[PDB]
Design a protein around this ligand. Structure first.
Ligand SMILES: Nc1ncnc2c1ncn2[C@@H]1O[C@H](CSCC[C@H](N)C(=O)O)[C@@H](O)[C@H]1O
Ligand SMILES: [Zn+2]
Ligand SMILES: [Zn+2]
Ligand SMILES: [Zn+2]
Lengths: 104, 55, 81, 431, 52
């Protein structure tokens, strides 16, 4: 009789609310540097090649993309809350972009 | 002034972009003036919705 | 470089949504976030590229990026603007 | 009610007011990563001037830290000192008593009515590493102790309640428990608390689900008395090759941990698919490939009867009936009669030769393989059959499969033999 | 109940009627799996009747 009682798992939302507080308190970059840099180079390749990208330009692009995505997710959370849901769906993303004017 | 005060509540002697973002976004008229600007390494103000919380 | 749009991984976009105060994430949303991120990056990269091409340069600098962002009403502080 | 055994239970171990640590590194929150920016709730201190009690961070307050299972620390949080979210630190346990149960030994009862979601008692013990846990487990197995006293605080870190701990070690397992264990963060440390899943009245026993990992240990029968009891204490076993079928059912087929190991080791490691641990789907190939040996133990006969009452699979029943055919010990057969094996065999017949999920030739082979031991078992009185009325099922199946004349003739011989038996006299009772 | 000592050794019942007393006790407790030849079940039944 040497068995061990298990601590079970957390409820859905508890670790979510914890990590919400943790990411809203801290300020580090959430997108990995090298895959984002490769993605930026892939997008820039389509117009004209042999285009070198300074580290500061890549960092500015990353900061702008993170700010845009955070604002869009705040608006999409407001959309989901308005529809009596707690889970965001792509339809809220499309509606937020529509009302913001980014999507025609 | 507002950034130094916000740093003072954080028990810090170093002004960082986080304190600047806190000072700008927590003041109504400053938020109105600097509406369409993103502060690099500023982060986001802690905001959790009321009905988002469990009961 | 071949199809590195998958480099924006699922935990990373989960973190980005989590900073916005979102509690639950649908399984189909990730492709939509990748698409809108691609669209935004496409627009800003295009504007930065033509800014650089007008300047007779071969390397995109941070000033072109901040200029392009500020021209789209997305003014960025901290990078020499 | 039962006599109180609180002091007697306390004398059996070294009472602790707080968790003890083997070393200062173990038990630290965030795997030892000191969160210097400790999570401070924005609650304003609500001091009731009459009672002098700080009502901030209460049960029905909106304290974020309370929701996220984090305790407020005095001098760091805006809620002030002595808030209502210092339950672990203030040690405000629910009032409980110890009473001797009929079969489970000492058990914990509520001395007062306890609200839903209320903190009952902090599980206390020594925080130990994995090697120390293994050494203590081996020592206790050598000592022959028949009681669990280990709980997993987190990965690689366990809590032992054998020699030192608190009253929580006397809580008994219930398959429909009224309380549950939860993990909380107090400062830079991790605690395990026990909370009320429902409303509990005074005098009622306080129980929680053990969800016990055996780590290869043998099953222990569960005597909780709950209607939803599974009959044994357990939980998801070792990561692979550990179980293909439920124990009683596996041991009914003569299979053990070695035979359940061998099949998976021979195929899964050699690029052939075996699904995860799930007993909802029976793998017929394993049951066919299993070896069969005669039964000579009555507990194995009880496990066989449980397997008959539980398993619906055609192939498992085929192999159990074949094993019974190999079995020829009269005492085990008398035990099966006491367990009313005929009652189970009636349903086993009905599911296969009245309900038709199989082919008539294979069902005929099954019927010929199941009539033989029915013909062979010792019988002395129709009182045995009367507990099952399996003769009715035999008539129904000989009438349905009337074209298969060997089955009909065997059932003729069987009912002729059974009809010769008298009925055991049962004393009439007043009405 | 299966021990060396016996419940009925503290009564006036003669040892030739011990199985009779155990059959009375078993039939009184509404048991139906009982068989007359099973002395063990008889002893269990009488033990649970006299000392539940
Ligand atoms: N419902 C139950 N049925 C049978 N045994 C139980 C049980 N709940 C707990 N136990 C036993 O109690 C052990 C936990 S320790 C509980 C206190 C201990 N029985 C004592 O009185 O000293 C388990 O390992 C098991 O052996
Ligand atoms: Zn609080
Ligand atoms: Zn508090
Ligand atoms: Zn049980």
């Amino acid at each position: 009789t040497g068995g061990v009682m298990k601590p079970h798992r957390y409820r859905p939302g508890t670790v979510a609310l914890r990590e919400i507080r943790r990411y809203q308190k801290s300020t580090e970059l959430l997108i990995r540097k090298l895959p984002f840099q490769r993605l930026v180079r892939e997008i820039a390749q389509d117009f004209k090649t042999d285009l070198r990208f300074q580290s500061a330009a890549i960092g500015a692009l990353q900061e702008a993309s993170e700010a845009y995505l955070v604002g869009l997710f705040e608006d999409t959370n407001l959309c989901a809350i308005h529809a009596k849901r707690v889970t965001i769906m792509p339809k809220d993303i499309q509606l937020a972009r529509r009302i913001r004017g980014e999507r025609a | 002034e507002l950034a130094g005060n916000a740093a003072r509540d954080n028990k810090k002697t170093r002004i960082i972009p986080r304190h600047l973002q806190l000072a700008i976004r927590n003041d109504e008229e400053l938020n109105k003036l600097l509406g369409r600007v993103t502060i690099a390494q500023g982060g986001v103000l802690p905001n959790i919705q009321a009905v988002l919380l469990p009961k | 470089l071949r199809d590195n749009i998958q480099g924006i991984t699922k935990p990373a976009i989960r973190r980005l949504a989590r900073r916005g105060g979102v509690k639950r994430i649908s399984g189909l949303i990730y492709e939509e976030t990748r698409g809108v991120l691609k669209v935004f990056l496409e627009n800003v990269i295009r504007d930065a590229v033509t800014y650089t091409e007008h300047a007779k340069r071969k390397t995109v600098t941070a000033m072109d990026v901040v200029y392009a962002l500020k021209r789209q009403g997305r003014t960025l502080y901290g990078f020499g603007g | 009610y039962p006599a109180d055994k609180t002091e007697e239970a306390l004398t059996t171990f070294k009472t602790l007011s707080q968790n003890s640590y083997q070393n200062k590194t173990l038990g630290n929150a965030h795997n030892g990563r000191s969160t210097a920016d400790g999570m401070s709730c924005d609650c304003e201190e609500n001091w009731d001037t009459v009672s002098g009690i700080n009502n901030a961070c209460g049960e029905y307050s909106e304290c974020i830290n309370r929701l996220t299972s984090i305790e407020c620390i005095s001098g760091t949080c805006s809620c002030g000192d002595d808030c209502q979210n210092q339950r672990f630190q203030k040690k405000q346990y629910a009032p409980i008593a110890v009473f001797e149960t009929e079969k489970k030994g000492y058990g914990v009862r509520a001395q007062a009515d306890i609200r839903q979601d209320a903190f009952i008692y902090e599980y206390l013990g020594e925080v130990i590493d994995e090697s120390t846990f293994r050494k203590r487990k081996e020592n206790y197995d050598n000592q022959g102790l028949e009681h669990f006293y280990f709980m997993m605080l987190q990965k690689g870190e366990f809590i032992d309640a054998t020699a030192k701990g608190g009253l929580g070690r006397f809580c008994n397992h219930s398959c429909r428990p009224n309380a549950y264990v939860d993990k909380w963060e107090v400062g830079n440390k991790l605690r395990m608390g026990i909370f009320a899943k429902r409303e509990i009245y005074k005098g009622e026993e306080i129980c929680f689900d053990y969800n016990v990992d055996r780590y290869g240990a043998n099953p222990q029968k569960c005597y909780c008395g709950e209607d939803n009891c599974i009959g044994f204490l357990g939980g998801r076993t070792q990561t692979d090759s550990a179980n293909i079928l439920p124990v009683p059912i596996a041991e009914a087929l003569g299979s053990t941990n070695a035979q359940e190991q061998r099949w998976v080791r021979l195929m899964k490691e050699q690029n052939k698919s075996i699904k995860a641990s799930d007993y909802s789907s029976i793998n017929e190939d394993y049951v066919n490939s299993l070896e069969m040996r005669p039964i000579a133990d009555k507990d194995e006969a009880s496990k066989v009867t449980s397997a008959l009452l539980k398993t619906q699979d055609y192939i498992i029943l085929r192999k159990l009936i074949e094993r019974v055919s190999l079995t020829k010990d009269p005492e085990v057969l008398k035990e099966i009669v006491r367990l009313r094996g005929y009652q189970c065999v009636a349903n086993i017949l009905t599911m296969i030769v009245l309900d038709q999920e199989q082919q008539q030739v294979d069902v005929e082979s099954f019927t010929l393989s199941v009539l033989d031991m029915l013909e062979s078992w010792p019988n002395s009185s129709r009182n045995r059959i009367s507990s099952s009325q399996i003769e009715s099922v035999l008539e129904s199946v000989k009438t349905k499969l009337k074209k298969i004349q060997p089955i009909g003739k065997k059932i003729n011989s069987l009912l002729n033999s059974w009809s010769k038996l008298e009925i055991s006299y049962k004393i009439p009772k007043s009405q | 109940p299966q021990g060396e000592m016996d419940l009925l050794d503290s009564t006036r019942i003669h040892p030739e009627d011990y199985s009779l007393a155990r059959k009375m006790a078993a039939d009184a407790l509404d048991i139906e799996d009982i068989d007359d030849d099973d002395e063990s079940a008889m002893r269990n039944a009488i033990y649970e009747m006299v000392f539940p």
